[PDB]
Amino acid sequence: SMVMEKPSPLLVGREFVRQYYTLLNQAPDMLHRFYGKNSSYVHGGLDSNGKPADAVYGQKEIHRKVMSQNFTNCHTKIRHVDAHATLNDGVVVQVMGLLSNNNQALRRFMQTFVLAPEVANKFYVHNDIFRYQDEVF
Amino acid sequence: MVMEKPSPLLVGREFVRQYYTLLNQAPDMLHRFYGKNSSYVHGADAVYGQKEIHRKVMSQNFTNCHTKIRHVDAHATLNDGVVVQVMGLLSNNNQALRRFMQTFVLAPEVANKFYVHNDIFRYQDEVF
Amino acid sequence: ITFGDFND
Amino acid sequence: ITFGDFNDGEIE
């Protein structure tokens, strides 16, 4: 009945970051459905020789690396979200905040997204770069 | 004479090096990295294109910028553009180093020549 | 409001 | 690589 103005890249971005981190609290074994194929993904961590882990691609290899990080009661605090229009119909969403897994303590992180169109007015995750500070500093 | 192939993490890592080396050598030319309809978001709101970016970079009186880059992440994105996330430290005017995040989206212009289309930057200090 | 596979 | 607006050489 009422028609309202479409959301702005800044509004689209904060509303994705809102939807994302609450799902990861409620049910992280669905979090892969924000991604399409060709979707970059690293979520922190180190490897064998101490260096920062590398990325995984595609909706299915994400669902694997997402569940080995066994999320449990992820309590999360976004301090800052910044988002702007990009190449094509996309949005880049720098994110900064505090994530807490397994009742372990709060750790600061630095995140970038790229949200991309697919209906054509729906947004999926084409890249997702996440890094904790204490593993890089 | 000798021929190879290229890489996103390499382009991304290459670009960074140069971004933050010209950032110290000549910030007054940092703008030439960007094209039309590019976003410069430094800290706060955005500014657009060659001329305004040049004026914002001026106003922040970058003088003797030193950087320690701790981790560069790069991945191909939409246009066969590249998205880069950097983490590390910047100092200015011989002050003390401040932890910073910076997000670039690089986009192709010409053969093999990238230009910066989105540039978000923030410090740890005034976020958490 | 909705992203990815999800159905409003 | 070359970036943006710069002639190879003055980049570094």
Author numbering:
A (entry chain A): 0 to 117, 120 to 138
B (entry chain B): 1 to 43, 52 to 117, 120 to 138
C (entry chain C): 473 to 480
D (entry chain D): 473 to 484
What does the primary publication say about this deposited structure?
G3BP1 plays a key role in the assembly and dynamics of host stress granules (SGs).
To verify our hypothesis, CHIKV-26 peptide (residues Ile473 to Pro498, without the α2 region) of CHIKV nsP3 was prepared and mixed with the NTF2L protein. Compared to the CHIKV-43–NTF2L complex, we found that the CHIKV-26 peptide and NTF2L cannot form the high-order oligomer. In addition, based on our isothermal titration calorimetry (ITC) assays, the binding affinity of CHIKV-26 with NTF2L is reduced approximately 100-fold, compared to that of CHIKV-43 with NTF2L. Meanwhile, we noticed that the binding molar ratio between CHIKV-43 and NTF2L is about 1:2, while the corresponding value is 1:1 between CHIKV-26 and NTF2L. These observations suggest that the α2 region does play a key role in the formation of the CHIKV-43–NTF2L oligomeric complex. In addition, the CHIKV-26 and NTF2L form a complex with an approximate M.W. of 40 kDa and a 1:1 molar ratio.
